[PDB]
Structures are given as structure tokens and as C-alpha cells.
Structure 1
């Protein structure tokens, strides 16, 4: 307890000795409260004016406009699983880390890799120096990391504290993030959750492949496809989950092993967190369970634990084991022989991205196999605890990573599987920018990032192909796309480029696409088809409305408004790539 968190707690008390007070009005039951000190401090969503001026019909659609305006889950506790549950989880975790390790070598990530990440600008969740980029050069920072690092090898921790701010993001100081990245970065940096290595994973696949992947799961013999979301996944990670995740250190050696064992032991299985309570004060609270790590390591361990949970739900539906209460010795033998005999085949029946999953089990007994899943604390969202899962019968209706997928037949008979979501969501997200101080140039370059993503991923939506052409016509041709349209770890961001978008489309959808046999290049945007007119309207298209027809017909006036604001620059007209503007 305080033997592991004490140093951190006592160090904080000393930097706020003037203010320290053991309050009696602390709203913590499940979190252990330690003390409080004086604070005075808090970034809301800003609108992107380039995208808004070029999407005027949506200015009167509340689903779009409300996206730009702007607890009882973090302060709960999960029961400890039954003994049979613990046994299933240890055996499956042991086996899963062995499978993920067969063709990969755990290894430390480097200052250099971390330096390039911050220099290339990435979302690490950080807080003497003001910018992360500057701290990477001030050797004093690296001496602070060295100081901490040697404490970790001594099995102690001084500065690895969380700043808390169905979401809450646990920021840490850049040095705390370096040491996490050094010890566990390999999981993401070397693609341990790729489909090739994990069979169930989709890390680095890209949104152009997820649909083809769901269609390949559909080709397997079995029952419905199940996509049960969990109710607040990060808050349901048990210390037993944290202990099965830690068994990755069993595959490590030397310094690496000691560094990873201390991240698990001292930051994950024992946390210290500063919450900013308006009543304002800074509470120093602690706890052993729940997820609280870097977003990228959180993705990897979520995928791992979810892969484990879903194989165990599959075992339960196949009657590999009778009850979670206690596992017989012969049932343990059976679970292992099951894993050895068909583990890899059953991983390939899944697509898993963090807390999100699609399972095509052997048959529909999976639907009522709920005891292990509820007893692991992975309670399904929006359905009665003991009510059977509603499956899907068509892979084109299954939700995954906030998308559904359409089969789209090109004029030449070749078959695209394309991602899609309600168009109000796509336009509402492109109208939002994060953070302060953006120039008009930076704003335009973020608008251009969204526009190129739409041209590559959502070309089949009439309204997004037109708006993407308008935005690319309205931003200087040579200005480079900036920021991130998305942070999804499945994403590959082929739209972040100044290459010609028809050249990228051909590479992504034809040349590099293993589901396309005939590699005949497409020569024009007119060869590239749309969803049916009715399919387009069902997924939120404004085609057949008057506001939309005025917008499309007068698009060159909206393009000219934005060109006049940006000023006298080199622009290209992309509207003639569409038939209706081709004179």
C-alpha cells in the first residue's frame, strides 16, 4: 500500500506543505483518499471556419451543430471473479501471450523513437519546460528520467502520478510517459496486435480493410455475428486482469524485464491520481484496479484482455467447462487441449479493437453464454444482465469501430468493401478543431486533412465527394494537410499527403488491396461509384433537399468566399473531376 505509493504521496505533500489538509468531506468510497491542497486552474471544442463555410446546408441540422457545443463510473468497484473464472483467465492469458510471442521479440523502445514521436507531434497524454519538444533536448529532463528509471530498477517510484481530467484521460508528466513507452511501447511499435500476428486484432489495418476483414469472418461456418459493447470497459478492468496482462514480462529479460515489471507493479496495479474537485481543491487519491495508462498501451492491453474474455465466452458456448464456481482438474486439461486444438481457429472468428469486438462463434449457444462474461465484470451495455445477446445475420449491418460496411460494385464488376457512418457524424467532426492559437493557414490545412480522408474513405457518399472537392479547391494546392482527422490505432492515414488523391485511391483500393485480383488502374473519379441514391439518403445524405441543390449548383461562390479570406495564393479547381461540373 503506502509502501509503494507513500514516496509519491509524501513528495506531493512537501511541495504543498502550506495548504495540506485531511478533508472529511471527500466524495470517495472506492478510491482511497489521502489528502488535499489549494489549486486555481481549469479547452473546449472550437469550430473550423473553412469546413463550416463549405458545408452551409448543415448549419440548420441540429445533429451536426450540437456536436460543437459543451463521474458515476470511475467511483465504482468490480467484485473479484470466482475461482473457476480466475483459472480460465490465467490459462487463456498464459496461452495468448505465448501465441502473440511466437514470431515477435519483446524489446525496449528508445529515447530516439520517443524523441521522433514528439518531434513528429503525437498524442502521448502529457502536461520547467512548456512544450514536450523542448524537454526532449534539455538533458536535465533525461536526468529526471534517469533518476526515476534507477528508482524503478530499485522497485520504487517517486514522480509517476496521474492527472485525471464515458471518457476521462489520465495525463502524466512526459518522463512518466517515456518510461511506460520504453517498457511496453514494443506492443504497438512492433504490431503485436496485427491481424497477421494476433489473428483477432486489426491494429494498423486501416478503415479500407476492416470491411473486407468482417466479410472474411462472415465466410466461416457458424451462427450470427455478435457485437456486444461493454458498459465502461476501462472502469471494469479487475486487478486479476492487470495480473494476467503483467504475464507479458515472463517473455522479457534483463533490464527490460525489471523496467516492465515496475510499470505494471508501481503505476498500473497501484496508482496515485490528482483530481481537481471544485468544492477548488486537489485530492490525492489511490486505487489498485481499473485501466489507467497511456492511450496506446491501453489500446494494446484492452485488445489483449478482450481477446481473452471473448475466447472464454466462446469456450462457455461450446460447453468446454460446466460452471465458473470451480474448475475440475480434467476441465483445466480440456480448456488447454481446446486452446491447443482450435485456439488459433477461434481467434480468426473475431475482429477486436480495444474494448470493441465482433465474434462469429461456432453456433448461437454463444448468445446465452453469459456467466463467465458477467463474472469477469465485462457486463454488456444496454441489455438485461441475463438476457441473451441479439446477433446480426448480415456482415453489412454489424457495427465495428463506429462504422458499418457496404458492398459496392464498380461499373467494371470489381467489388469494393467501403466504410460508412451517419453523414451527420462525419460533417460534425470535420467542423471541430482542438486547442487554441490556430492561424487561418493551420485551420485550412486541417480542413484539407478531412477533405482528403473523405475522398479516400467516403468517396461513395455524394455529399462528401462534392464537399471534399470544394475544400481541396478552396485551400492552396501545395499547402500540406496537418493534425489528425482521427487517432484510431486501426487507422493508417494514407490521406496525410500532398500526392494526387486519385493516385492514392488507386494504390489503396487497387494496387495494395489483397481482395482485388485485377490491378487495372482507374483513370478518372467518374469510374469510381457511389452507394445507391436511397442507400445514400438512409446513411444521412441531403440529396433531394432544396438547400443541398442550391449548395451544389452555387459551390464555386462558396469556394470563392474561402479563397478571398485566405488571399492571393495558388489554387486548383477540382470540381470538373465530377460529371455535373464537367461543363
Structure 2
């Protein structure tokens, strides 16, 4: 089918592992082309490492089911195969000809709108090097060593010369030093050709209208509140089932239209990324066999490779396009007859885009596969023909059952959170991010690496605690647990690793600066929705959620076990201090 594009990559893998290369007839691949297997040592673990510092200071959550579940993520070849079979080995039916036509018209208009002020450009070796260096001082260490080796860049140049001839020899996606250099080299080449979407803020709210890039978790609630003021129907936030697996060959060709705005030298490189690694891909996946573990080499023409970071911007683009198409259907612009029609009237779609498209983009908050839409009316709730036909089937709901919208922006699911408007004691309002408290505690109790010292583990606990003090201060249990962790860890110990990989995280908690000072900077000084810049001088003036809402959202406040924990927390803090040693601590309780 496509061996002329993927053949050189498979030939190189096969030559490198010819001692154990074989065709396994028991391969479970149904929708992916299977090329072969070779022996590998199994990677991953059946369960996550536990952060003992966070665990010792959150004893009431030792029982809680969601907390116990989050520590059971299986990353072994058995776990990889399970996820692959249940989620990735699917085929999306091809959209109808009228659906493909409206998508193409909308994609061309959207790219033109997105590129009205900005022009695409190539990203560079020093840009990638700087990003890698700033992230290593938060594998990043391995990546920092690779960017400092001139042989890595000479390998990058050889692969770029193949891409310029329309060939690919080593850009393989993963579901010795040489293979790590080839993977990081593939990521560099992708960054060089498509990194501009992220680096130049193409999906910022000012540039894209719907986008939220660069806003930060602390600003998303304010944007949903601003959207709530636009006249129209309810706010809809439908979750797509496995968004990345529903990116069709038609979606990929619509995303590729951005190459039309590039300079010749950039278009050549971006066309190679689109054709060789996005629209044709070679993937490695581990699989357990009766006699050991193999690495399977598979390929397909559609879906995304999640590891690519160019996928965030392209997912945002395709979601903005799909939601505009759904809004057109709700408004009666797109009928069932149009979706089936190759010959639909292009001009009525163009006219709707040119007269109402930007206004309709302003009614949305879109981040990758996450969307919030406030349509002009509720007909949108039942406009499902185009959405299902485009392959974006909603998760856990019958295909034709109407979407449920929200009339309170505070109840809307966006980027794994919901948002509350709080009234401070001085009358000022704050709009804060929130999620089930068991998820926040469960995540903070997971360590990220093996062989970590008590220092590295305590510093990751401190990073989680400071993130809670800045984003989730309004949750009573989290402010208390945060104070306990910060009192148990040396004040000069710098938080390490990362609390989240989310694009919305700005990592203001990765500091040894006083958290109240940082809180003031984020919530008051730099908050554009805070008109009165009066600083808050004490945590007693930093508000909480309403007790009832805190309890509805997972708080243990009012339980006897929680009261016992709060009363005995100086004892647990002292136990952690005793094991850390004679360092400088501070009492935050």
C-alpha cells in the first residue's frame, strides 16, 4: 500500500535487529498494518511509585478508592497491549461527501483567519536547545546531553537532507544512544517545521478567538465567565471518545493546508512532516509473548501520534473547525441533504463564515479535544449529523441522544476542571479552578521515578503542596495538607520534577519564594480581571469555597477522621522532619 514512504524506516529497524527479526503470525493488529517484531527487554511497571512524604501527611486518604486507583496505572507490555486493543485498533467511517466539502471550506477559511497577522516560520536548533535546557532545570537530562553533542545535530542534518528529497529513514513514533538520538531528532525536525504554531502563539485567544494558549489554568474560568455573557443558548462541553483515534485522513489533509502560507524552504520541510510522519507513520509497540517480550512495528495512514507536540495545535485547529460546522448545522445552514451532497452550495457556507465566523469563534473556548461552545440557541443540542459524520462521536452517550448543556458557566467541564466565582472578605471576586479532590490528592501521592532519594521525593511533595496553595487554596483539606508538607520540607529545598504535563500549567509553584507573595502576583497584580490591585496581606483573607461546595467536591471536612488528622498533623510533620534530619524548617500551621 504505502511501502515506498515507510519502507526505508522498516528496512533500518529490520537491519539493526536482524538477529531476532521475525514475522509473528499471532500479532493482534486488525486496523494497523503489521510489518514484524524483534526481541526487547520489557519496560514499565504494573503500579506507580508512592510519594511517602505526601502519603504520611494525608493519612485519611489512605483508604479512599480513587486515591488507591491512581497508583495502579499499568505501563508494562500487558498494559500497553490492553490500551491499544480497546482504544487504538479502530477504523473511523469516512465522512460523507458534503461533510468533507464543508470541512474543507471551513479549514481554508480558518487557516486564512489564523494567519491574518502572523506568518509561519521555521524553528531553530538554539530555540529547541533553550527549551530543552529550561525544562531540564525544573528524559530532560538525556535530552540536555544530546543537544550539547554535535553528533546529534549532524544526525539531524542527515535526516533533514532525506526529508528534502521526500524520504524518511529514522522518524519512528514510540507508543542505545543511536535510537534515543533518532527519536529526539524526529521531535526536533517536527519542531523545526511545525513548532511555530506553539512558539508564535497561533492558538492564543487574541489570534484564534476560540483558543486559550498561554492563558494558564488560573485564567480559564474567567474566559468561561466572559463567554457566559454572550447572548445565546446554553454552554455545551461534549467530550469526544478517543479524539486522537478519530482524526481522519480528511482531517489530516485539511490540517496540511497551512503549508500554503509558508516560504518555499519551510513548506518543503513541513510537507515532509505531514506526508512522511503524520499521514504515513511507523510505530513501535511492546507486546508480551509466551517466551518473552517483542517490539512490534506497525503503520497506518490516519489518527495522531500523541507524542508529537505539534498535535496540540492541530487538534485545536480541527476541533475549532468541527465546532463551527456543528454551529452551522444548529443554525440551519447545513442540512442532512447537504451532508450527503458532493455538489452542496459552497457559497452559503462561505457567506456564513465571512459574516458570522469570527463571532461564532468568540463563543468557544477550545484546547486540543476540549471544547466549550455557547451557540446562538439550543438547536445545537440536537445538531449531531455533522459531528457524528466527521467521526467525532461523543463519549458514553447514544449517538443521537441530544447534548446536555449548562446554564451555569460554573458547572461547565473544561480541561479536567470546573470553575467557581468566590467572594473574598473585602468584596472582590475571584474565579478559581477546581476538580474532585480525590484526583488532586491521588496524583500528588504518586512519585515519578525509581531510586529517588528522600530529598527528591520531599521536593516533589513540596511542588504539589505549592501548586495547591496557588491554584486549589479554596479547598480546606488542600490548604491544610499544603501547609503540613511545606512545614515538613527544609524551606530552602527547591521543588523538583513537575506536578503536571498540562499546557495550562505555568509552574509558578516551582520556586522558594513565599507562596502568599506568589499568590498576590498571580491572583491580584497580574490578574487582568482584578481591577483593584490591593494586596492580600494574610492567608486569612484568601477565600475558601463554600463548605457545602467543598464537601460536594470531595472534602472530608466534617468527618471525624479528618478532624483527628487536623488535630494530630504537628505529630506527622515532626516525624517527616526527624527522617529528613537537622535542616531549617518553618512552621506554617
Length-normalised TM-score, structure 1: 0.94
Shift of the alpha carbon at 1:171?
A: 12
Q: Does 1:259 align with 2:269?
A: yes
SS at match of 1:324: helix
Q: Does 1:384 align with 2:387?
A: no
Partner residue in 1 for 2:575: 561
- Runs of 4+ in structure 1 deviating by more than 3 angstroms, as ranges, are none
SS at match of 1:313: helix
SS at match of 1:133: helix
What is the rounded CA distance, in whole Å, between the counterparts of 1:188 and 1:122 in structure 2?
Answer: 19
Determine if contact 2:146/2:181 at 8 Å carries over to the other structure: no
Map 1:495-510 to 2 at 5 A: 495-510=509-524
SS at match of 2:38: strand
Determine if contact 2:422/2:432 at 8 Å carries over to the other structure: yes
Map 1:3-18 to 2 at 5 A: 3-18=4-19
What is the rounded CA distance, in whole Å, between the counterparts of 1:554 and 1:283 in structure 2?
Answer: 53
Partner residue in 2 for 1:43: 44
Determine if contact 1:268/1:293 at 8 Å carries over to the other structure: no
What is the rounded CA distance, in whole Å, between the counterparts of 1:67 and 1:94 in structure 2?
Answer: 42
What is the rounded CA distance, in whole Å, between the counterparts of 2:153 and 2:87 in structure 1?
Answer: 37
Partner residue in 2 for 1:167: none
Equivalent position to 1:341, from 355, 368, 382: 355
Equivalent position to 2:340, from 317, 325, 333: 325
What is the rounded CA distance, in whole Å, between the counterparts of 2:41 and 2:433 in structure 1?
Answer: 45
Map 1:24-173 to 2 at 5 A: 24-44=25-45, 45-70=48-73, 71-121=85-135, 131-164=142-175, 173=183
What is the rounded CA distance, in whole Å, between the counterparts of 1:255 and 1:69 in structure 2?
Answer: 47
Partner residue in 1 for 2:373: 359
SS at match of 2:410: coil
Q: Does 1:513 align with 2:523?
A: no
Partner residue in 2 for 1:395: 409
What is the rounded CA distance, in whole Å, between the counterparts of 1:294 and 1:105 in structure 2?
Answer: 25
Shift of the alpha carbon at 1:327?
A: 5.7
In the superposition, relative to structure 1, how do residues 56 and 511 fare at CA in structure 2: closer, same or farther (>3 Å)? same
Partner residue in 2 for 1:272: 282
Per-residue CA deviations over 1:391-430 (Å, capped at 9, x if unaligned) read 1111111111111111111111111111111111111111
Shift of the alpha carbon at 1:328?
A: 4.7
SS at match of 1:262: helix
What is the rounded CA distance, in whole Å, between the counterparts of 1:470 and 1:295 in structure 2?
Answer: 38
Determine if contact 1:454/1:465 at 8 Å carries over to the other structure: yes
Determine if contact 2:132/2:144 at 8 Å carries over to the other structure: yes
SS at match of 1:173: helix
Moved more, 294-303 or 237-246: 294-303
Structure 2: stretches of 5+ with no match in the other structure: 74-84
In the superposition, relative to structure 1, how do residues 389 and 490 fare at CA in structure 2: closer, same or farther (>3 Å)? same
Q: Does 1:20 align with 2:21?
A: yes
Equivalent position to 1:375, from 377, 389, 392: 389
Equivalent position to 1:310, from 305, 323, 329: 323
Equivalent position to 2:198, from 184, 188, 195: 188
Per-residue CA deviations over 1:431-462 (Å, capped at 9, x if unaligned) read 01122221211111111111111111111111
Structure 1: stretches of 5+ with no match in the other structure: 165-169, 576-583
Determine if contact 1:43/1:435 at 8 Å carries over to the other structure: no
What is the rounded CA distance, in whole Å, between the counterparts of 1:493 and 1:518 in structure 2?
Answer: 25
Determine if contact 2:114/2:202 at 8 Å carries over to the other structure: yes
Length-normalised TM-score, structure 2: 0.93
What is the rounded CA distance, in whole Å, between the counterparts of 2:6 and 2:355 in structure 1?
Answer: 44
Shift of the alpha carbon at 1:377?
A: 0.4
What is the rounded CA distance, in whole Å, between the counterparts of 1:176 and 1:91 in structure 2?
Answer: 31
Per-residue CA deviations over 1:94-114 (Å, capped at 9, x if unaligned) read 111111111222111111121
What is the rounded CA distance, in whole Å, between the counterparts of 1:374 and 1:172 in structure 2?
Answer: 38
Shift of the alpha carbon at 1:81?
A: 1.2
What is the rounded CA distance, in whole Å, between the counterparts of 2:259 and 2:53 in structure 1?
Answer: 49
Determine if contact 2:136/2:144 at 8 Å carries over to the other structure: no
Determine if contact 2:469/2:482 at 8 Å carries over to the other structure: yes
Determine if contact 1:48/1:431 at 8 Å carries over to the other structure: yes
What is the rounded CA distance, in whole Å, between the counterparts of 1:171 and 1:320 in structure 2?
Answer: 50
What is the rounded CA distance, in whole Å, between the counterparts of 1:224 and 1:7 in structure 2?
Answer: 52
Partner residue in 1 for 2:497: 483
Equivalent position to 1:297, from 304, 310, 330: 310
In the superposition, relative to structure 1, how do residues 105 and 294 fare at CA in structure 2: closer, same or farther (>3 Å)? farther
Shift of the alpha carbon at 1:381?
A: 0.6
